[PDB]
Amino acid sequence: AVQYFQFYGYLSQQQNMMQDYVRTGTYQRAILQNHTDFKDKIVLDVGCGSGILSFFAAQAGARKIYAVEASTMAQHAEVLVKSNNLTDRIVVIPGKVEEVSLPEQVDIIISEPMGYMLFNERMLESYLHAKKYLKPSGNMFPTIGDVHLAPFTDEQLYMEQFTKANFWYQPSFHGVDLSALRGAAVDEYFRQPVVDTFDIRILMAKSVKYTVNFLEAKEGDLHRIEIPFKFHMLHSGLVHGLAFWFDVAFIGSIMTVWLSTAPTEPLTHWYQVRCLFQSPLFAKAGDTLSGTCLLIANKRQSYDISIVAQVDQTGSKSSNLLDLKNPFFR
Amino acid sequence: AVQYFQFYGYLSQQQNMMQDYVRTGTYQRAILQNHTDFKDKIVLDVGCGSGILSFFAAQAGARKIYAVEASTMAQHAEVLVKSNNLTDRIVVIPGKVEEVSLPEQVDIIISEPMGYMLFNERMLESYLHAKKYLKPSGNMFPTIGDVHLAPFTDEQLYMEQFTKANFWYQPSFHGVDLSALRGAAVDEYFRQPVVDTFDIRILMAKSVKYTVNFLEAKEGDLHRIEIPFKFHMLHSGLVHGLAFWFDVAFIGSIMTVWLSTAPTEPLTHWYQVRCLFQSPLFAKAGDTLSGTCLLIANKRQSYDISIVAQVDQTGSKSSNLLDLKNPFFRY
Ligand SMILES: CNCCN1CCC(c2cc(CN(C)C(=O)c3cccc(Oc4ccccc4)c3)ccn2)CC1
Ligand SMILES: CNCCN1CCC(c2cc(CN(C)C(=O)c3cccc(Oc4ccccc4)c3)ccn2)CC1
Ligand SMILES: Nc1ncnc2c1ncn2[C@@H]1O[C@H](CSCC[C@H](N)C(=O)O)[C@@H](O)[C@H]1O
Ligand SMILES: Nc1ncnc2c1ncn2[C@@H]1O[C@H](CSCC[C@H](N)C(=O)O)[C@@H](O)[C@H]1O
């Protein structure tokens, strides 16, 4: 937990998020275009960081914004509120949203708590926890989140894992036979989700989606995320794993605005995420690839990813276990 | 410390070090060419990782090798010891070298405990701690470590970091004035040591050298490291900061072998490290740039670095703090 908040205490890391124009600009649009959800309202910004989203709420006419931040970035946010002459409308509260007190309930909660695969870092639990401060029938921005999953083919990505692991498959590395560790090295590489982007042409079926409605969901609902899937294959080929991305929707009174990290959309700082299967699966066009993706929360602020999958027509099966806390940036 | 040993538990990270041919090859040359320091001797490998250095000690004819390793990599080392039929000579000992109980005093300690700028990660303290197991006559491989510092000029590097920091100069980022944080951003960005390599042509004077003798140094000596300097400037220009590298020497009974990470030598996985000044110092050829680099060990297995430098001929001074645990790896 200390390292987590120390990371967000760096201005360079806040800057990284601020500079993601799709992200920051879409939040600004969502808030300003839904000005009646803000005008003269009370706002909670969960994990304000620099304060940027709270400034957008102020731009849209909010009366009072409580900006809660657990890292030492709270001190820098405070400097910005004073220097932007907004002391009377934005109040920076240092600490965890789970531990602080607010002086009143709010009309609307705003936050950017989305990790890789939507759920990484487990901050959505803090966002849902914050609903203890939300007036009855208050709103949340973002309001819902969709995680999409789809099968891909990438022969070169799959092959790469062996190329790397075959370092160990040599009998005389400076006189040492390394070969006995090759299997362990393979296993290690396959446990890493791959964070990068890709051409949509690699996708072999229409995505399935799993939706969380943040107005209704409880913290505990994010501890175990079960995503069944049944893909009807558009192309014949070897399925090397599943690709993941996510969308959030800001459902306001005037309009619904979407922030998407899909591979069809301009790139964001989240990229997309791919989990390889241990062993690829052959599927022909029209076959069904079924199984479940289970995301199991862990004590390292992340998830273990369990994927089991089969091609129904053949019965050939595969699986993988991945560690979302150890992604490979490709 | 839990994260620290977890990192070294990954085979991919052990591979990264092993695939540094200069590093791994030079360790092997040092050990094999000084085989009389190993022949029928007792050896301690501090932080054996894959076991690689312990295999080198076995190649040189060591009677018995205690291969100490605190990460889960210990289990993989033992797989290799067995698959290489060396259970008779290499004894993997899981745990911290500070906390295990070896049955025997040793003739020689081998290790690769060097971090960025030599001292990062504080593993040299574990290496020095291990001297409780060293016989009076005993040797250490490496035997000494030299840190080199020299002033550099690199306007492109300076402007890259300055431009990042000046994101926080913006008076209207999506309508928001960030400019009150300009100074805080410059402080943070310039606290990051820059890890990459560079052309030697950027160096403005001969390096100053600080030496640690591992045969004599006590663990506590590395808690405060004071390196005074007085550079005789060989070129006129802006001094953008100090560049650091390090060498280690294996002082064997037969021969001394050096492993160098200098920018005049083939690249190693350590690259070199540069500490930028927030504002460069103007110097003329013939001037003297004097001051002190002070490294203070901290509770995050790293060092707070203080660099105070002044051009004596003008009184122009730069004071800098750097966080050796937050390096910027530049592509
Ligand atoms: C706040 N919303 C946008 C976050 N958006 C910018 C930040 C980015 C990110 C965060 C973190 C979070 N962090 C400091 C952790 O301690 C942590 C915790 C749980 C899990 C986790 O998994 C990762 C491991 C390696 C690399 C990245 C994550 C990291 C680390 C690195 N990069 C993630 C993407
Ligand atoms: C054993 N000698 C060779 C090590 N050689 C291969 C490993 C390489 C390295 C080690 C570490 C050490 N580590 C796991 C830490 O927890 C740690 C501890 C203290 C400080 C520290 O400073 C860094 C911060 C960011 C990136 C790197 C270091 C890291 C992390 C990343 N890369 C360093 C170089
Ligand atoms: N439980 C919690 N309570 C308070 N702040 C938290 C928190 N969990 C995460 N945070 C903070 O939430 C922020 C997420 S990054 C988003 C920052 C900013 N709102 C923006 O959109 O640019 C980080 O600054 C992190 O320190
Ligand atoms: N105090 C300590 N006790 C035991 N092992 C340690 C230690 N401090 C660091 N290590 C281990 O020392 C190793 C340093 S990396 C070098 C690995 C190997 N000797 C090689 O040269 O290739 C890591 O595997 C790390 O886990």
Dump the DSSP string for A99-143: T---SS-EEEEEE---BTTBTTTSHHHHHHHGGGGEEEEEEEES-
Instruction: At B205, give phi and psi (nearest 5°).
Output: -160, 165
To the nearest 10°, the Cα dihedral for B16, B20, B21, B26?
-120
Give the CATH H-level superfamily of domain A144-330. Hnrnp arginine n-methyltransferase1 (2.70.160.11)
Question: Considering only CB atoms, which chain B residues are within 8 Å of A179?
Answer: 83
Instruction: At B213, give phi and psi (nearest 5°).
Output: -100, 110
Token digits for B131? 């001297």
Q: Ligand 2 centre and the CA of B268: distance in Å?
A: 15
Tell me which fold the domain B1-142 belongs to: Rossmann fold (3.40.50)
Are A175 and B59 a contacting pair at CB < 8 A? yes
Among chain B residues, CA nearest to A177: B84
Q: Atom 14, ligand 4: which residue's CA is nearest?
A: B47
Distance CA A246, CA A113 (A): 13
For the Cβ of A121 lying below 6 angstroms from any atom of ligand 1, the answer is yes
The catalytic site residues of A sit at: 20, 112, 121, 269
When scoring B21, B53, B112, B174 by the number of chain A Cβ atoms within 10 A, the one with the most, hence best to mutate, is B174
Token digits for B286? 């013939």
Question: Considering only CB atoms, which chain A residues are within 8 Å of B326?
Answer: 10
Q: Which helix H or strand E contains B314, and what residues bound it?
A: none
Distance CA A325, CA A53 (A): 27
Distance CA B156, CA B83 (A): 51
Give me the count of residues in chain B.
Answer: 331
In this structure, which ligand is nearest to the CA of A71? 3
Please say whether the beta carbons of B262 and B210 come within 8 A: no
Distance CA A153, CA A79 (A): 49
Q: Ligand 4 centre and the CA of B301: distance in Å?
A: 14
Q: Among A38, A74, A215, which Cα is nearest to A144's?
A: A215
Give the CATH H-level superfamily of domain B144-331. Hnrnp arginine n-methyltransferase1 (2.70.160.11)
Contacts of residue B163, Cβ cutoff 8 Å, sequence gap at least 6: none
Could you list the residues of A known to form a binding site for S-adenosyl-L-methionine, using ranges: 14, 23, 47, 69, 98, 126
CA-only gyration radius of chain B, Å: 22
CA A230 vs CA A25, A169, A272, A286, A304: distances in Å: 35, 38, 21, 12, 21
**What number of other Cβ atoms are within 10 A of residue A128's Cβ?**
24
CA-only gyration radius of chain A, Å: 22
- Preceding peptide of A142 cis, ω within 30°: yes
Q: Resolution of the deposited coordinates, in angstroms? A: 1.9
Measured from the Cα of B329, ligand 2's closest atom is 26
Among chain A residues, CA nearest to B185: A11
Distance CA A25, CA A38 (A): 17
Distance CA A287, CA A103 (A): 57
In this structure, which ligand is nearest to the CA of A69? 3
B172 touches A: beta carbon within 8 Å: no
Distance CA B243, CA B207 (A): 9
Q: Which of B3, B55, B188 sits opposite A175 (nearest CB)?
A: B55
| Concatenated DSSP letters of B163-193 | HHHGGGG-S-BTTB--GGGHHHHHHHHHTSP
- Preceding peptide of B103 cis, ω within 30°: no
- Identify the burial level of A33 via C-beta atoms within 10 angstroms of its C-beta, where 0-12 means exposed, 13-18 middle and 19 or more buried: middle
Distance CA B163, CA B157 (A): 10
Query: Judged by CB atoms within 8 Å, which residues 67-126 of A form the interface with B?
Result: 76, 79-80, 82-84
Q: Among B259, B14, B273, which Cα is nearest to B142's?
A: B259
Please say whether the beta carbons of A93 and A67 come within 8 A: yes
- What are the sequence ranges of the domains in chain A? 1-142, 144-330
- Identify the burial level of A127 via C-beta atoms within 10 angstroms of its C-beta, where 0-12 means exposed, 13-18 middle and 19 or more buried: buried
Distance CA A13, CA B164 (A): 11
Q: For chain B, after which residues does the C atom lie more than 2.5 Å from the next written residue's N, i.e. where is it broken? A: none
Q: Which of B15, B28, B326 sits opposite A174 (nearest CB)?
A: B28
**What number of other Cβ atoms are within 10 A of residue A150's Cβ?**
24
Q: For chain A, after which residues does the C atom lie more than 2.5 Å from the next written residue's N, i.e. where is it broken? A: none
Distance CA B208, CA A168 (A): 41
Question: Considering only CB atoms, which chain A residues are within 8 Å of B11?
Answer: 168, 181, 184-185, 188
- Identify the burial level of B63 via C-beta atoms within 10 angstroms of its C-beta, where 0-12 means exposed, 13-18 middle and 19 or more buried: middle
**What number of other Cβ atoms are within 10 A of residue A271's Cβ?**
19
Distance CA A64, CA A67 (A): 10
Token digits for B60? 């040189």
Distance CA A268, CA A280 (A): 29
| Concatenated DSSP letters of B244-265 | EEEEEEEE-SS-EEEEE--TTS
Contacts of residue B85, Cβ cutoff 8 Å, sequence gap at least 6: none
Catalytic residue among B88, B216, B265, B269: B269
CA B67 vs CA B20, B50, B81, B92, B161: distances in Å: 21, 10, 10, 5, 42
Question: Considering only CB atoms, which chain A residues are within 8 Å of B28?
Answer: 174
**CA angle (A245, A249, A252) in 5-degree steps:** 175
Would A1-142 and A144-330 be classified into the same CATH topology?
no
CA A280 vs CA A64, A165, B193: distances in Å: 54, 17, 43
Q: Ligand 1 centre and the CA of A115: distance in Å?
A: 7
Treating both helix axes as pointing N-terminal to C-terminal, what angle do B21-33 and B52-59 enclose, rounded to 10 degrees? Answer: 30
Distance CA B295, CA B281 (A): 22
Q: Is B121 a catalytic residue?
A: yes
Could you list the residues of A known to form a binding site, using ranges: 14, 23, 47, 69, 98, 126
Give, as one character, the DSSP assignment of residue B16: H
Distance CA B276, CA B196 (A): 13
If DSSP codes are grouped into helix, strand and coil, which group holds residue A43? strand
Q: Among A120, A110, A108, A111, which Cα is nearest to A246's?
A: A120
Distance CA B81, CA B313 (A): 61
